[PDB]
């Protein structure tokens, strides 16, 4: 069974940081794309199985997506948070979704 | 003529098979020949493109033939292709390919192009073999510019992305919410590249609610998503149509899918359909085609097994029962593909099809494309989304072809306006291919095919040899027709467009009858061009039999044959002006001359019926031997046939004085008539001279029985 559980939320409303953790239960996180989607749904990041990294232009100097094979969890080390970033962030191979307030 | 002359090393060469495979898939007219012929026939354009599989055959050929082809290439302007990375944009053959003393093409380059200064002719030399997709991509343009746009492919590509087996998964192998939404978004985002590009879906309604709660939620989302999507008919329970030998059960299956179609707002105005594993389509089942037009009005369909499954570059299309059948080429996506790693062949096997496999061959050598994929490649891992997206990205990244995914009706119409000779079908034997035997219904038998062929011509003794071979205990005849009677008129006329089962109706069942040997006397097969190729395609082991008499006597016999058949052209016009008629004549007199003097040229018709069969299968017989002592001629036809129990025909047959032949036989084969005119005989001997000396060296060339009439009329000339 493929399941994707995400967590992490809230920030300094003038600008702060977060590390959203998307845990891949039941399958391997290094075999799938695990691209992050913010609400329609917009794919601001992606983290490939060899570790390649793609961003949109709004997030390109700010966000840092990452992966860890050991806890089988893809992390989104966010930085310098604009007020436009507030959304439901979906890690999709979809997941339940978690809310950021900034 | 745009006949492509190919110099292959052997018939089993791999590069030669690839070159001729590209040639028949793009319908380039070819003729196979081993590399060492007649370069021009009576000072005309026999060839227009000269393809060499080996460059050493073009360089190290005979000096007389080399200077002769140089004279032919300078005087007529033909193309020379010789087989031993981006594309150059400043090239005159960039009508298909799109860039992502001699001039380069694939920039030196593996595919070069010379303007012509040393030999004064345009030529293209392939440094690499035919394995990479780019080589084939520029090979089409090389063939087109080396022939002066006479062997081309149109710019308007017509791609039909078809998706079979919708709602066929049992549990866990279906679609969900995210993949369905990504499928609709994939159709709309890629609609800017290609006008009205969609994903034609093959729905099944029995396996619709067998999935889980997550699988059912994604399938119910497609019902309100039917506004901008194309869907094609399939059947309810997803079973092959050869098991359904009745119209009721198969029509009820598609009627249940029609209920499924009108129930969920699915459009039925498309006219396309697919059966699972392509059952009952080749061999043509009347039940499947009639059920298609009866309950769904399907006029466009597809097939993956014409004239055999292996390979796919030999795939054709045909128009049967008003249904324009097209060739179907899968992209490797079958129903056993669940995940990315559950694909048959690994993850690199699907990428092989994307980066230059069957996908690119189907959209490049054929202007019309049909593809095969199912719901299981769109669910758990989205195989077809990535595959078709990268495919269509490859098409706009490598082709100038203005491609539009339009409805299948005009897509099939364009397939038949481009391919004019592919309008007619070409039937084969279903028992030679075990896959075709499994695809065809098991209700019918397998040995209803005859083993002897009587090509004719008429008025030479074919009815006598037909009726005298029916009294043999190990030889059996066919059922007589209503209009043609002993003739079946299948291979030479329009009866060939009726199906393989149409020909089996005339022959008896091998289980009910004790004798399995069959034959038919269709004597109008001699004066035909399409008949030997069709006869060799359906029956490659059926031996032929032809009888020849004097062409003056046969022409006068045809003249009085038309006189007994109430033809007014033979009744009014005298035979002497028919043999001397020219261009300034009536249409009826020209038609009578075309049916009276044309089929007396036995050399051209034996050349037609000889190029499609083995020389041992042919047996030419003299007619005067059948008139004087036919029993010895029946002894040679028994040794030619190889029967089990040979009977004595000297005891059974006897001389008949009122018939004039040894026999019993009809009045139409023993008509009494007076002789000709001396001037008519002189002009008939001078008219049939070249045909008689050509027939003399032609019959002596085959090493068979030399005729007595040929020896009698040959001594007057030589
Ligand atoms: N043994 C034979 N029995 C009957 N006809 C024969 C024969 N050998 C040759 N023939 C010729 O076969 C012709 C008829 O051939 P077919 O069966 O194709 O109609 C006849 O032409 P004619 O009867 O006009 O003189 C006859 O000359
Ligand atoms: Ca199927």
XYZ file of C-alpha atoms in Angstrom, chain B:
718
model
C 7.658 4.405 -63.480
C 8.725 4.956 -59.813
C 10.000 1.389 -59.380
C 12.647 1.241 -56.670
C 15.485 -1.022 -57.811
C 17.004 -2.646 -54.723
C 20.314 -4.548 -54.909
C 20.162 -6.868 -51.931
C 22.906 -9.367 -51.099
C 20.477 -12.136 -50.103
C 16.766 -12.530 -49.376
C 17.525 -13.088 -45.671
C 19.646 -9.941 -45.203
C 18.735 -7.871 -42.142
C 19.510 -4.454 -43.699
C 17.671 -5.487 -46.855
C 14.629 -6.517 -44.797
C 14.698 -3.118 -43.069
C 14.980 -1.191 -46.387
C 12.146 -3.125 -48.104
C 10.153 -2.913 -44.822
C 10.392 0.893 -44.986
C 9.518 0.705 -48.701
C 6.304 -1.314 -48.288
C 5.268 0.573 -45.141
C 5.536 3.817 -47.138
C 4.204 1.994 -50.269
C 7.306 2.526 -52.403
C 7.033 0.261 -55.473
C 9.854 -2.308 -55.372
C 11.221 -5.429 -57.054
C 13.787 -7.619 -55.285
C 16.975 -8.630 -57.086
C 20.355 -10.059 -56.089
C 23.237 -7.659 -56.794
C 25.311 -8.729 -59.860
C 19.734 -6.342 -65.650
C 17.472 -4.564 -68.151
C 17.807 -0.924 -67.151
C 15.236 0.452 -69.623
C 12.312 -1.247 -71.361
C 11.924 0.034 -74.970
C 13.459 3.411 -74.105
C 11.194 4.181 -71.133
C 11.565 5.040 -67.449
C 11.665 1.621 -65.779
C 13.392 2.835 -62.596
C 13.422 6.133 -60.699
C 15.256 5.240 -57.462
C 18.234 2.903 -57.164
C 18.895 1.667 -53.601
C 22.074 -0.302 -52.793
C 22.291 -2.210 -49.517
C 26.073 -2.432 -49.950
C 28.152 0.407 -51.405
C 30.586 -2.161 -52.858
C 27.869 -3.359 -55.242
C 27.549 0.141 -56.707
C 31.304 0.765 -56.788
C 32.518 -2.662 -57.991
C 29.824 -3.437 -60.593
C 30.493 -4.375 -64.247
C 32.029 -1.579 -66.365
C 29.410 -1.899 -69.127
C 26.599 -1.844 -66.565
C 28.281 1.043 -64.687
C 28.580 3.193 -67.830
C 25.022 2.151 -68.739
C 23.618 3.276 -65.358
C 25.628 6.508 -65.665
C 24.010 7.116 -69.070
C 20.581 6.276 -67.597
C 21.112 8.535 -64.567
C 22.256 11.519 -66.644
C 19.572 11.077 -69.329
C 16.584 10.354 -67.047
C 17.553 11.678 -63.598
C 17.070 8.842 -61.093
C 18.177 8.628 -57.473
C 21.077 6.553 -56.156
C 21.003 5.414 -52.506
C 23.998 3.562 -51.100
C 24.306 2.105 -47.609
C 27.835 1.672 -46.231
C 23.534 13.986 -33.948
C 21.363 16.858 -35.195
C 19.902 17.718 -38.613
C 21.239 20.521 -40.816
C 18.494 23.184 -41.244
C 19.760 24.515 -44.602
C 18.872 21.386 -46.545
C 16.483 20.938 -49.509
C 15.015 17.732 -48.038
C 13.797 19.230 -44.753
C 10.132 18.734 -45.677
C 9.657 16.036 -43.006
C 12.585 16.294 -40.563
C 12.872 19.227 -38.138
C 16.229 20.336 -36.660
C 16.393 20.246 -32.867
C 30.634 19.169 -54.196
C 28.384 17.652 -51.534
C 26.219 19.018 -48.758
C 25.592 17.434 -45.341
C 22.225 16.426 -43.920
C 22.848 14.921 -40.471
C 25.682 17.182 -39.305
C 31.011 15.015 -41.800
C 27.654 13.233 -41.554
C 26.321 9.682 -41.595
C 23.795 10.705 -44.279
C 25.315 12.959 -46.943
C 23.964 14.397 -50.203
C 25.860 15.205 -53.394
C 24.594 17.719 -55.950
C 26.390 15.964 -58.805
C 29.578 17.049 -60.548
C 31.562 13.817 -60.885
C 28.637 11.776 -62.245
C 26.160 14.655 -62.667
C 23.400 13.145 -60.530
C 22.008 13.618 -57.032
C 22.813 10.788 -54.611
C 22.515 10.053 -50.879
C 25.037 7.815 -49.084
C 24.148 6.245 -45.715
C 27.228 5.694 -43.563
C 25.328 3.825 -40.849
C 22.823 0.972 -41.043
C 19.061 1.170 -40.573
C 18.733 0.853 -36.785
C 18.550 4.410 -35.454
C 15.326 6.406 -35.832
C 17.069 9.494 -37.269
C 18.415 7.432 -40.187
C 14.892 6.339 -41.173
C 13.604 9.888 -40.566
C 16.019 11.312 -43.132
C 15.719 8.187 -45.332
C 12.122 9.129 -46.211
C 13.296 12.582 -47.326
C 16.232 11.025 -49.207
C 13.796 8.834 -51.175
C 11.559 11.853 -51.819
C 14.219 14.287 -53.060
C 16.143 11.675 -55.046
C 12.958 10.929 -57.034
C 11.993 14.578 -57.607
C 8.971 14.558 -55.206
C 7.396 11.617 -57.082
C 7.738 9.148 -54.165
C 6.751 11.318 -51.221
C 4.570 11.331 -48.125
C 2.097 14.189 -47.444
C 2.741 16.853 -44.810
C -0.625 16.276 -43.127
C -0.006 13.585 -40.504
C -3.082 12.157 -38.837
C -2.443 10.549 -35.435
C -5.186 8.612 -33.612
C -4.193 7.924 -29.999
C -6.473 5.073 -28.886
C -6.660 3.727 -25.334
C -8.253 0.301 -24.957
C -9.687 -1.677 -21.963
C -11.219 1.132 -19.850
C -12.689 -0.338 -16.617
C -11.182 -3.820 -16.924
C -9.185 -4.116 -13.687
C -10.245 -6.548 -10.985
C -8.745 -4.995 -7.840
C -5.841 -2.598 -7.395
C -5.017 -2.304 -11.114
C -7.325 0.595 -12.072
C -7.195 4.397 -12.097
C -7.575 6.854 -9.189
C -8.379 10.547 -8.619
C -4.918 12.049 -9.282
C -4.110 10.070 -12.448
C -7.542 10.846 -13.984
C -7.094 14.578 -13.274
C -3.558 14.378 -14.693
C -4.977 12.630 -17.774
C -7.507 15.419 -18.464
C -4.772 18.025 -17.855
C -2.411 16.102 -20.167
C -5.070 16.220 -22.896
C -5.653 19.981 -22.513
C -2.011 21.081 -22.102
C -0.967 19.162 -25.176
C -3.872 20.514 -27.261
C -1.879 23.634 -28.150
C 0.827 21.578 -29.894
C -1.701 19.568 -31.914
C -5.210 20.898 -32.764
C -8.077 18.996 -30.997
C -5.685 16.292 -29.703
C -7.442 13.908 -27.320
C -7.172 10.401 -25.887
C -9.676 8.010 -27.546
C -10.884 5.575 -24.820
C -12.097 1.948 -25.184
C -14.684 1.390 -22.419
C -15.912 -1.859 -20.812
C -18.892 -1.765 -18.454
C -18.801 -5.126 -16.647
C -15.610 -4.445 -14.684
C -16.629 -0.922 -13.634
C -17.313 -1.312 -9.885
C -14.967 -4.212 -9.064
C -12.265 -1.887 -7.725
C -11.815 -0.501 -4.231
C -13.169 2.741 -2.778
C -10.209 4.722 -4.122
C -10.481 3.074 -7.547
C -14.232 3.698 -7.821
C -13.831 7.364 -6.827
C -11.477 7.984 -9.737
C -13.685 6.198 -12.254
C -16.788 8.189 -11.271
C -14.861 11.423 -11.757
C -14.497 10.650 -15.505
C -18.280 10.819 -15.999
C -18.496 14.612 -15.626
C -15.132 14.811 -17.437
C -16.668 13.399 -20.654
C -17.197 16.960 -22.009
C -13.721 17.152 -23.616
C -12.586 13.550 -24.221
C -12.961 11.072 -27.057
C -14.179 7.540 -26.398
C -14.445 4.515 -28.683
C -16.607 1.338 -28.509
C -15.451 -2.007 -27.064
C -17.466 -4.777 -25.341
C -18.928 -5.311 -21.891
C -17.321 -8.495 -20.486
C -13.931 -8.083 -22.357
C -13.861 -11.461 -24.111
C -12.696 -12.264 -27.638
C -15.375 -12.202 -30.377
C -14.372 -15.508 -32.006
C -16.058 -17.422 -29.183
C -19.270 -15.519 -30.009
C -20.218 -17.211 -33.262
C -23.761 -15.731 -33.159
C -24.993 -12.170 -33.802
C -27.192 -12.272 -30.680
C -24.531 -12.817 -27.984
C -21.892 -10.493 -29.517
C -24.521 -7.835 -30.311
C -25.828 -8.117 -26.738
C -22.295 -7.533 -25.392
C -21.873 -4.343 -27.422
C -25.498 -3.407 -26.646
C -24.676 -3.554 -22.929
C -21.680 -1.329 -23.640
C -24.034 0.965 -25.595
C -26.228 1.135 -22.480
C -23.047 2.017 -20.579
C -22.307 4.687 -23.212
C -25.673 6.482 -23.097
C -25.877 6.031 -19.316
C -22.725 8.007 -18.465
C -23.020 10.649 -21.217
C -20.354 9.006 -23.390
C -20.385 10.033 -27.111
C -21.046 7.345 -29.753
C -20.398 9.500 -32.856
C -16.773 8.447 -33.338
C -16.854 5.282 -35.438
C -13.793 3.434 -34.086
C -13.575 0.035 -32.335
C -11.043 -2.576 -31.077
C -11.448 -6.255 -29.993
C -9.149 -7.803 -27.308
C -5.905 -9.172 -28.884
C -7.592 -8.385 -32.264
C -9.764 -11.454 -32.571
C -11.979 -12.113 -35.580
C -10.587 -9.242 -37.642
C -7.991 -11.097 -39.779
C -9.362 -13.843 -40.591
C -12.387 -11.672 -41.232
C -15.357 -12.765 -39.169
C -18.637 -11.614 -40.709
C -20.182 -11.543 -37.210
C -17.746 -8.954 -35.773
C -17.926 -6.579 -38.768
C -21.716 -6.846 -39.077
C -22.140 -6.379 -35.313
C -19.892 -3.292 -35.543
C -21.999 -1.672 -38.265
C -25.287 -2.978 -36.819
C -25.076 -1.688 -33.247
C -22.288 0.887 -33.488
C -21.910 2.056 -37.177
C -18.168 1.368 -37.013
C -16.614 2.239 -40.349
C -13.011 2.571 -39.096
C -11.238 -0.199 -37.212
C -7.748 -1.507 -36.609
C -5.672 -4.716 -36.843
C -2.277 -5.947 -35.527
C -2.014 -9.119 -37.626
C -2.149 -8.346 -41.375
C -0.710 -10.370 -43.139
C 0.987 -11.799 -40.040
C 1.862 -10.414 -36.616
C 5.618 -10.518 -37.120
C 6.683 -7.852 -38.216
C 4.770 -4.555 -38.056
C 6.216 -2.773 -41.095
C 4.371 -5.183 -43.406
C 1.032 -4.083 -41.927
C -1.732 -3.066 -44.334
C -5.246 -1.735 -44.305
C -8.320 -2.709 -46.314
C -11.973 -1.848 -46.905
C -14.265 -4.784 -46.145
C -18.089 -4.550 -45.771
C -17.888 -0.760 -45.844
C -15.391 -0.689 -42.950
C -12.086 1.048 -43.624
C -9.743 -1.199 -41.602
C -6.414 0.371 -40.643
C -3.154 -1.125 -39.349
C -2.642 -1.029 -35.586
C 0.822 -0.793 -34.047
C 1.148 -1.036 -30.277
C 3.527 1.102 -28.247
C 4.448 -1.885 -26.084
C 1.713 -1.130 -23.537
C -0.248 -4.328 -22.871
C -2.746 -5.281 -20.171
C -0.051 -6.968 -18.046
C 1.696 -3.635 -17.395
C 0.863 -2.454 -13.869
C 3.866 -0.489 -12.535
C 7.031 1.017 -13.966
C 8.977 -2.099 -12.954
C 6.103 -4.478 -13.746
C 6.419 -3.708 -17.479
C 7.353 -6.702 -19.681
C 10.986 -5.960 -20.487
C 11.925 -3.424 -17.805
C 11.673 0.360 -17.608
C 14.140 0.793 -20.484
C 11.908 -1.269 -22.791
C 9.158 1.377 -22.843
C 11.737 4.152 -23.351
C 13.038 2.184 -26.359
C 9.586 2.561 -27.923
C 9.535 6.269 -26.981
C 13.068 7.107 -28.167
C 12.722 5.637 -31.640
C 10.712 2.426 -31.445
C 7.370 1.299 -32.972
C 5.855 4.653 -32.039
C 8.186 6.652 -34.287
C 8.013 4.043 -37.106
C 4.209 4.210 -37.083
C 4.156 7.994 -37.239
C 7.032 8.239 -39.758
C 6.732 5.551 -42.449
C 2.946 5.596 -42.350
C 1.161 8.983 -42.600
C -1.721 7.683 -40.444
C -1.154 6.338 -36.940
C -3.159 4.125 -34.584
C -1.846 3.148 -31.167
C -2.599 0.463 -28.557
C -2.578 0.993 -24.761
C -4.974 0.166 -21.904
C -6.347 1.553 -18.608
C -3.714 -0.332 -16.585
C -0.956 1.942 -18.042
C -2.882 5.005 -16.740
C -3.615 4.003 -13.164
C -1.049 2.878 -10.605
C 1.971 4.446 -12.326
C 0.796 6.553 -15.384
C 2.843 4.788 -18.066
C 0.935 6.066 -21.091
C 0.959 9.700 -19.878
C 4.762 9.846 -19.766
C 5.031 7.673 -22.904
C 2.593 9.629 -25.087
C 3.713 13.027 -23.704
C 7.368 12.294 -24.470
C 6.261 10.831 -27.845
C 4.307 13.889 -28.917
C 7.153 16.090 -27.596
C 9.505 14.042 -29.834
C 7.154 14.631 -32.787
C 7.150 18.405 -32.450
C 10.859 18.330 -31.640
C 11.764 16.294 -34.735
C 9.076 16.741 -37.467
C 7.825 19.646 -39.675
C 4.646 17.641 -40.347
C 1.498 19.606 -39.539
C -0.181 16.899 -37.501
C -3.804 17.121 -36.359
C -5.659 14.540 -34.282
C -9.028 14.608 -36.065
C -11.973 12.052 -35.974
C -11.276 8.522 -37.339
C -13.640 8.802 -40.380
C -11.590 11.314 -42.381
C -8.442 9.808 -40.785
C -9.278 6.565 -42.605
C -10.388 8.506 -45.692
C -6.961 10.170 -45.855
C -5.376 6.709 -45.407
C -7.119 5.525 -48.540
C -6.527 8.705 -50.587
C -2.799 8.431 -49.825
C -2.680 4.643 -50.310
C -4.642 3.841 -53.460
C -3.318 0.305 -54.033
C -3.935 -0.604 -50.376
C -7.702 -0.152 -50.894
C -7.974 -3.757 -52.052
C -7.366 -6.592 -49.547
C -4.972 -9.540 -49.741
C -6.119 -12.762 -48.074
C -3.809 -15.461 -46.693
C -4.187 -18.990 -45.352
C -5.286 -19.078 -41.673
C -3.735 -22.497 -41.000
C -0.155 -21.428 -41.781
C -0.098 -18.911 -38.918
C -0.907 -20.550 -35.576
C -1.709 -17.121 -34.107
C -4.255 -16.540 -36.875
C -5.699 -19.999 -36.192
C -6.125 -19.111 -32.517
C -7.616 -15.713 -33.455
C -10.089 -17.286 -35.924
C -13.165 -19.188 -34.725
C -12.815 -22.899 -33.974
C -16.243 -23.745 -35.434
C -14.993 -23.844 -39.039
C -12.536 -26.426 -40.373
C -9.048 -25.884 -41.848
C -8.615 -28.028 -44.977
C -11.250 -26.560 -47.322
C -8.562 -25.030 -49.557
C -8.063 -26.648 -52.989
C -4.766 -28.082 -54.174
C -5.094 -27.713 -57.979
C -5.706 -24.525 -59.968
C -7.070 -24.205 -63.504
C -6.177 -20.766 -64.841
C -7.291 -21.391 -68.407
C -7.613 -19.631 -70.834
C -11.052 -20.251 -72.332
C -11.745 -22.262 -75.499
C -8.743 -24.581 -75.107
C -10.067 -27.718 -73.341
C -10.225 -26.766 -69.647
C -13.730 -28.220 -69.223
C -12.597 -31.540 -70.717
C -9.610 -31.760 -68.366
C -11.826 -30.607 -65.476
C -14.576 -33.177 -66.081
C -12.083 -35.927 -66.862
C -10.224 -35.357 -63.582
C -13.437 -35.514 -61.565
C -13.954 -39.208 -62.307
C -10.713 -40.033 -60.477
C -11.322 -41.666 -57.048
C -8.608 -39.676 -55.253
C -9.605 -36.369 -56.889
C -12.750 -34.365 -56.099
C -14.337 -31.241 -57.574
C -16.096 -28.187 -56.146
C -19.714 -27.084 -55.960
C -21.043 -25.520 -59.202
C -22.125 -21.889 -59.033
C -25.441 -20.448 -60.181
C -24.198 -17.921 -62.771
C -20.521 -18.732 -63.407
C -21.248 -22.515 -62.920
C -17.790 -24.196 -62.991
C -16.034 -20.848 -62.625
C -15.816 -19.218 -59.213
C -14.411 -15.906 -60.613
C -12.753 -15.068 -57.264
C -9.112 -14.000 -57.727
C -9.488 -12.095 -61.006
C -12.601 -10.014 -60.263
C -14.304 -8.137 -57.452
C -15.241 -11.395 -55.683
C -11.873 -11.236 -53.836
C -13.327 -8.410 -51.688
C -15.850 -10.836 -50.119
C -13.626 -12.587 -47.574
C -11.714 -15.820 -47.047
C -14.900 -17.599 -45.932
C -16.566 -16.721 -49.261
C -14.119 -18.979 -51.101
C -14.623 -21.806 -48.555
C -18.380 -21.879 -49.286
C -17.762 -23.320 -52.770
C -15.728 -26.255 -51.438
C -17.159 -29.182 -49.428
C -16.390 -29.909 -45.775
C -13.395 -32.274 -45.260
C -15.199 -34.183 -42.490
C -18.414 -34.872 -44.423
C -16.692 -35.815 -47.701
C -14.094 -38.588 -47.851
C -11.905 -36.917 -50.489
C -9.923 -33.855 -49.389
C -8.428 -32.906 -52.778
C -10.328 -30.045 -54.428
C -10.066 -27.956 -57.601
C -12.025 -25.449 -59.669
C -12.058 -24.472 -63.345
C -11.962 -20.675 -63.537
C -10.600 -20.230 -67.064
C -10.763 -16.396 -67.071
C -7.797 -16.247 -64.663
C -5.359 -16.308 -67.595
C -6.433 -12.860 -68.847
C -5.861 -11.086 -65.539
C -3.120 -9.218 -63.682
C -4.318 -9.094 -60.060
C -5.218 -12.853 -60.017
C -1.664 -14.498 -59.788
C -0.547 -12.376 -56.815
C -3.849 -12.930 -54.988
C -3.759 -16.662 -55.794
C -0.183 -16.914 -54.521
C -1.106 -14.955 -51.396
C -4.094 -17.121 -50.480
C -2.818 -20.462 -51.857
C 0.992 -20.660 -52.070
C 1.052 -24.464 -52.524
C -1.804 -24.824 -55.039
C -0.395 -26.111 -58.324
C -1.664 -24.471 -61.519
C -2.629 -25.996 -64.868
C -2.863 -24.302 -68.270
C -3.629 -25.648 -71.753
C -2.597 -23.920 -74.984
C -3.810 -24.317 -78.583
C -3.273 -22.250 -81.774
C -4.022 -18.549 -80.997
C -5.714 -18.085 -84.371
C -8.015 -21.032 -83.671
C -8.450 -19.921 -80.037
C -9.232 -16.353 -81.154
C -11.754 -17.656 -83.691
C -13.136 -19.930 -80.976
C -13.570 -16.857 -78.755
C -15.167 -15.080 -81.739
C -17.690 -17.874 -82.146
C -17.937 -18.208 -78.367
C -19.278 -14.657 -78.309
C -21.460 -15.566 -81.308
C -23.032 -18.366 -79.256
C -23.320 -16.034 -76.236
C -25.416 -13.558 -78.315
C -22.765 -10.835 -78.420
C -23.753 -8.425 -81.260
C -20.137 -7.357 -81.927
C -19.244 -10.834 -83.183
C -22.601 -11.109 -84.995
C -22.244 -7.923 -87.057
C -18.507 -7.429 -87.536
C -16.499 -9.902 -89.597
C -13.382 -11.398 -87.947
C -11.048 -10.126 -90.711
C -11.441 -6.475 -89.740
C -11.313 -7.340 -86.017
C -7.787 -8.674 -86.450
C -6.854 -5.499 -88.405
C -8.699 -2.949 -86.228
C -6.776 0.058 -84.946
C -7.333 3.249 -82.965
C -10.077 4.545 -85.295
C -12.767 2.088 -84.231
C -15.846 1.823 -82.039
C -15.789 0.992 -78.329
C -17.584 -2.348 -78.783
C -15.198 -3.454 -81.552
C -12.222 -2.393 -79.412
C -13.674 -4.330 -76.464
C -14.172 -7.452 -78.613
C -10.597 -7.108 -79.888
C -9.383 -6.696 -76.294
C -11.146 -9.898 -75.272
C -10.393 -11.858 -78.481
C -6.819 -11.011 -79.576
C -5.299 -9.993 -76.213
C -5.630 -13.363 -74.410
C -3.988 -15.305 -77.315
C -0.643 -13.890 -76.169
C 0.172 -16.816 -73.908
C 3.684 -15.485 -73.165
C 2.532 -12.392 -71.222
C -0.072 -14.305 -69.208
C 2.363 -17.137 -68.405
C 4.820 -14.392 -67.325
C 2.078 -13.090 -65.025
C 1.194 -16.533 -63.597
C 4.851 -17.645 -63.502
C 6.350 -14.858 -61.364
C 4.035 -15.769 -58.457
C 4.483 -19.559 -58.445
C 7.175 -22.226 -58.529
C 8.062 -23.688 -61.958
C 7.234 -27.224 -60.771
C 3.707 -26.080 -59.890
C 3.128 -24.971 -63.498
C 2.212 -27.552 -66.146
C 1.630 -26.423 -69.723
C -0.284 -28.881 -71.894
C -0.799 -29.034 -75.637
C -4.419 -29.014 -76.782
C -4.024 -31.143 -79.945
C -2.670 -33.934 -77.714
C -5.928 -33.703 -75.772
C -7.779 -33.945 -79.100
C -5.875 -36.963 -80.481
C -4.780 -39.153 -77.518
C -5.694 -37.507 -74.196
C -5.061 -40.578 -71.972
C -1.272 -40.195 -72.177
C -1.688 -36.496 -71.289
C -3.713 -37.623 -68.255
C -0.798 -39.906 -67.414
C 1.566 -36.887 -67.345
C -0.916 -34.873 -65.255
C -1.085 -37.803 -62.813
C 2.720 -37.827 -62.570
C 2.638 -34.041 -62.149
C -0.034 -34.324 -59.432
C 1.448 -37.312 -57.592
C -1.773 -39.184 -56.870
C -1.915 -42.217 -54.589
C -3.890 -44.799 -56.602
C -3.248 -44.201 -60.299
C -6.050 -45.447 -62.549
C -5.801 -46.575 -66.171
C -7.250 -43.834 -68.350
C -6.643 -45.872 -71.515
C -9.387 -48.320 -70.472
C -11.885 -45.774 -69.090
C -11.645 -43.332 -72.010
C -12.473 -44.298 -75.589
C -12.698 -42.607 -78.983
C -16.027 -40.938 -79.755
C -16.749 -40.295 -83.472
C -19.504 -37.681 -83.044
C -17.429 -35.689 -80.548
C -14.108 -35.741 -82.401
C -12.138 -36.257 -79.168
C -11.707 -39.283 -76.920
C -14.460 -39.408 -74.301
C -20.001 -37.371 -72.166
C -19.015 -33.730 -72.665
C -21.037 -30.585 -73.436
C -21.946 -29.058 -76.796
C -20.110 -25.802 -75.954
C -16.712 -27.550 -76.063
C -17.238 -29.331 -79.406
C -18.665 -26.659 -81.710
C -18.350 -27.202 -85.468
C -17.287 -24.255 -87.600
C -15.729 -23.666 -91.039
C -12.198 -22.458 -91.673
C -10.789 -18.945 -91.938
C -9.716 -16.744 -94.834
C -6.201 -16.998 -96.325
C -5.504 -13.267 -95.850
C -6.886 -13.495 -92.301
C -4.607 -16.471 -91.573
C -1.619 -14.601 -93.038
C -2.228 -11.490 -90.927
C -2.959 -13.659 -87.881
C 0.332 -15.502 -88.359
C 2.193 -12.202 -88.712
C 0.353 -10.716 -85.706
C 0.957 -13.764 -83.499
C 4.552 -14.266 -84.719
C 6.489 -12.577 -81.850
C 4.151 -14.240 -79.340
C 4.840 -17.685 -80.878
C 8.670 -17.387 -80.890
C 8.507 -15.808 -77.390
C 6.229 -18.670 -76.291
C 8.633 -21.178 -77.887
C 11.660 -20.006 -75.902
C 9.407 -19.450 -72.869
C 8.055 -23.022 -72.855
C 11.502 -24.422 -73.650
C 12.920 -22.237 -70.852
C 10.619 -23.877 -68.286
C 11.720 -27.366 -69.399
C 8.219 -28.714 -69.969
C 6.268 -30.330 -72.828
C 6.918 -28.606 -76.157
C 3.673 -28.342 -78.164
C 3.022 -30.016 -81.511
C 1.079 -26.985 -82.778
C 4.028 -24.765 -81.796
C 6.303 -27.071 -83.787
C 3.882 -26.966 -86.731
C 3.450 -23.179 -86.844
C 7.112 -22.623 -85.932
C 8.406 -24.422 -89.042
C 6.542 -21.982 -91.306
C 8.494 -19.053 -89.856
C 11.787 -20.776 -88.988
